[PDB]
Amino acid sequence: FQSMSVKGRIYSILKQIGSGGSSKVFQVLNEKKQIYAIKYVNLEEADNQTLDSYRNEIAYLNKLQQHSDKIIRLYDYEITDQYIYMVMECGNIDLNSWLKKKKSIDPWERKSYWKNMLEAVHTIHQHGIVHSDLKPANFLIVDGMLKLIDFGIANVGTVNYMPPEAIKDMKISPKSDVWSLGCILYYMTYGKTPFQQIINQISKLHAIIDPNHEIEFPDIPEKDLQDVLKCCLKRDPKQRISIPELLAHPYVQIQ
Numbered sequence: 647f648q649s650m651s652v653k654g655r656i657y658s659i660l661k662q663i664g665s666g667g668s669s670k671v672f673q674v675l676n677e678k679k680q681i682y683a684i685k686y687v688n689l690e691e692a693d694n695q696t697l698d699s700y701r702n703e704i705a706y707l708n709k710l711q712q713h714s715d716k717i718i719r720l721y722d723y724e725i726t727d728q729y730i731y732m733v734m735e736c737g738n739i740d741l742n743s744w745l746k747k748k749k750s751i752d753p754w755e756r757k758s759y760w761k762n763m764l765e766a767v768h769t770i771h772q773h774g775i776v777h778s779d780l781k782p783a784n785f786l787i788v789d790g791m792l793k794l795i796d797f798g799i800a801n802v803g804t805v806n807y808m809p810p811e812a813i814k815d816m817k818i819s820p821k822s823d824v825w826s827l828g829c830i831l832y833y834m835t836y837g838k839t840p841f842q843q844i845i846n847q848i849s850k851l852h853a854i855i856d857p858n859h860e861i862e863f864p865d866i867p868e869k870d871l872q873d874v875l876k877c878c879l880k881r882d883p884k885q886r887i888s889i890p891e892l893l894a895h896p897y898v899q900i901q
């Protein structure tokens with residue numbers, strides 16, 4: 647019977663979701679048996695840059711809560727020199743586990759999910775945050791609504807969602823998140839990411855950078871959706887569509 651106290655409130659552990667990185671995620675219940683998700687971070691072996699990365703992520707998460715409901719609720723938090731305890735809202739499943747399980751993907755639910763992501767990523771952009779590591783795992787379904795859980799600020803990993811400008815910078819702008827968001831919608835449309843096919847990562851990273859490598863957009867009934875994908879997957883960030891432009895796109899506005 648494991649428990650935890652956060653700002654003088656007792657939470658009984660229902661079960662553990664995530665682990666590793668010195669961070670554990672738990673489904674918990676308060677005194678009134680209400681569900682919440684608690685993120686625990688151990689700071690015992692964490693360096694100054696890491697601590698400040700964790701302090702920056704919490705500050706933004708807490709500020710940005712008032713600006714969108716597509717951003718995970720942070721109810722409370724405890725921060726000492728030894729740990730972080732984050733009392734957040736509980737979701738049913740993250741988008742990665744959801745997409746992996748689902749065979750069919752309803753065009754209406756795909757559209758609703760797209761709108762949700764755009765609003766969340768748009769909010770963070772307005773406060774000068776560029777995630778730069780967006781993947782389905784960064785989104786949580788919380789009662790048929792997608793919510794952004796991470797801001798890329800704090801510390802198996804895919805390379806399929808990486809923008810060409812991220813590789814070239816060896817340059818990151820809001821446009822980098824548009825590429826990654828485009829890969830999520832490409833996956834929700836074609837059941838794969840634009841460069842999933844390539845096994846050799848050195849060849850895969852070269853393909854994303856190479857403009858001669860043609861991204862395949864098989865014809866679909868939703869002509870609008872196919873345009874969104876072609877606009878997001880433009881290799882030149884200057885020629886790539888912006889998030890305010892995507893919110894004005896027929897695919898999000900016309901039903």
Ligand SMILES: O=C(Nc1cc(-c2ccncc2)c[nH]c1=O)c1ccc(N2CCCCC2)cc1
Pocket residue numbers: 663671683685718734735736737738739740743786795796
């Ligand atoms: O990540 C999950 N949840 C939560 C994560 C966070 C969170 C916030 C900030 N930084 C990290 C995590 C907040 N609030 C949650 O609720 C999750 C739940 C169930 C699940 N699965 C069940 C079905 C089979 C498949 C597995 C899968 C995932």
